Structures are given as C-alpha cells and as structure tokens.
C-alpha cells in the first residue's frame, strides 16, 4: 500500500485559515505567541514556527483585532498576552462566514 | 473579502479545472467567477496558470480553438497530477481539523 504520510507540506494552503485559527484560539482565553504556536502543532499543524506566528500577531494589532498585556507567565518569563478587542470579536465571526462558503465551493470543484 | 483565503485554495482548484479537460486563462476564470468568486481578476488566474508552469505541473499548447481564435491551452503533467491527488489529501486533513475547531472539538 501507500506509505504513511505524516502530514508535512501544508504552509501554502493554510494562508488565509492561520489568521482565522490563531484569533479563534485567542477568544477562548489570554495567551502568547510561544503557546499559540504549540496550540497550532498539537492540532496537526506541525511545520508553523513560532516566528511565524509573531508576523501574524503583529498584523492582528495592525488590525486592531487583539488587545496586548505584558506579565509574567506561570512558568516564569514574561510574556505579552493577547486577548480579543470588540473588533476582534466581530471579524473571527467574519472569518467563520467567509471559511464555511469557501468550504461550500471547494467541495463543488471537487464534485 | 475572500482574497486572503482564496491563497493557498485556488492553486488546487486551478489544477482540478485544468484536470477536467484542457481551458486556457479566460475560461477559467469564467468559471471561478461563475462558481460565486466574482471578485477574481483574469490577471490572478494566469499568474497561478504560470506559477504551475514554472513548477512544470502543466502541459502548454498553442493552437487555434474549435470556435477559431488562437490560445494558450492548459492540460496537467505528470507532476500536475500528482500534486492535485496530494492538494485533495492535505485539504482535507486540513478541513477536517478546522471543523473539530469550529465545532468546539480543538
Ligand atoms: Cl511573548
Ligand atoms: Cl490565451
């Protein structure tokens, strides 16, 4: 049979849903880039770097999308923690909308 | 506002038009406008025709079409079809992971 295929390779087609992943994992509590990005691989997504999550958390603020806190994590190291504005809020709402259309109309290409 | 999405989407869906029967730029953006994406420009659609030729996924023939004028056809190479079974698996592992997260699941 085919060989097992551990899932690499997908950094391309994640552009546009990354955004909309890591603001989703922002609403459900506080968190930083370090975590997002172990969030991110734990959930199969293994090649994203923690670098390239910063990019992104540097675009959410240029969006006004995330609201920032720099203190202390359990662990120790201070950390900025990232939460949702209103804003936030309203355009991972707007992501959900846009993803399940296009899902719609991905599976009607593949129809 | 789907433009952002659509990157990293519409190179699949380009080779799956292409798979289907040989088109040019013009067609396929015809029929990614008709599907419901009507803010795709003609001028995305053949920068990921040549994208794919540069990575020698597609097959390029010159010749004239069956109502007459002349165009540059797309069908897929070896390699084309390849990376299209491969674009259908990582989708969908990549959906299938999405969807436990909008369900609440991860
Ligand atoms: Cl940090
Ligand atoms: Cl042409």
Do not use: C, H
Not at 30 to 42: A, C, F, S
Not at 82 to 93: D, F, Q, R, V
Request: proline share 4%; no cysteine; hydrophobic share 35%.
């Amino acid at each position: 049979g085919s060989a097992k295929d551990p899932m690499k390779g997908l950094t391309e087609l994640l552009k546009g849903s990354l955004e909309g992943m890591i603001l989703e994992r922002i609403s459900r509590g506080e968190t930083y880039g370090y975590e997002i990005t172990k969030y991110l691989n734990d959930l199969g997504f293994d090649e994203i770097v923690e670098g390239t999550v910063y990019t992104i958390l540097v675009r959410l603020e240029k969006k006004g999308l995330v609201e920032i806190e720099k203190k202390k994590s359990e662990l120790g190291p201070p950390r900025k923690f990232y939460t949702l504005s209103p804003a936030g809020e309203e355009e991972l709402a707007i992501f959900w909308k846009r993803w399940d259309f296009i899902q719609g109309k991905i599976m009607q290409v593949k129809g």
